[PDB]
Design a binder for these strands. Sequence first.
RNA 1: CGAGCUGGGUUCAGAACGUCGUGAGACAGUUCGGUCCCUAUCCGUCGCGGGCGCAGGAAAUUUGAGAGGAGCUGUCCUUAG
Length: 50
Amino acid sequence: KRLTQQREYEKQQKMVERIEAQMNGLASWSEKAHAQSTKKEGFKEYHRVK
RNA sequence: CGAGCUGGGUUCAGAACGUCGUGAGACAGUUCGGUCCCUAUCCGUCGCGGGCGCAGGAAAUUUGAGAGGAGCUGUCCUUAG
Ligand SMILES: CC[C@H]1OC(=O)[C@@H](C)C(=O)[C@H](C)[C@@H](O[C@@H]2O[C@H](C)C[C@H](N(C)C)[C@H]2O)[C@](C)(OC)C[C@@H](C)C(=O)[C@H](C)[C@H]2N(CCCCn3cnc(-c4cccnc4)c3)C(=O)O[C@]12C
């Protein structure tokens, strides 16, 4: 039972670190995609919607 | 300056790559293809007429108020090594 609970805790801790990493990558893209708008090509809301 | 024109780019539907997302999809990217409608009423422009005016009716030649246009400049020689 200690092996079962240790495997399931290792799985949810690994999954938590994975989703926090893939959430941080999207944040570091949303900061760029908000700051690098308003420069050229399309007004400023076609790029703010992204 | 698209009721003047083009539509190559970008931001419609197809599709693909890189990348993200479990996912439908998305871009923090790139790539190929993609319907540019309208018989001009008025003003406004460019032209041409028709009426009347101008104290008679006519034919010609006109002054010019005013207005538009034009208004650019190279090189070579001489002066003179
Ligand atoms: C043929 C010209 C067409 O114009 C355009 O489509 C296009 C050239 C334009 O630019 C036009 C002016 C557009 O306006 C623009 O709209 C934009 C959204 C906005 C723009 N401004 C507002 C900024 C505005 O200018 C708009 C919205 O049209 C979509 C006008 C709107 C009233 C229409 O939809 C309109 C009724 C179109 N239509 C709908 C069917 C279209 C499918 N179809 C295509 N071919 C056939 C077909 C062929 C052969 C036989 N039968 C059918 C059928 C037609 O049948 O004819 C149209 C008038």
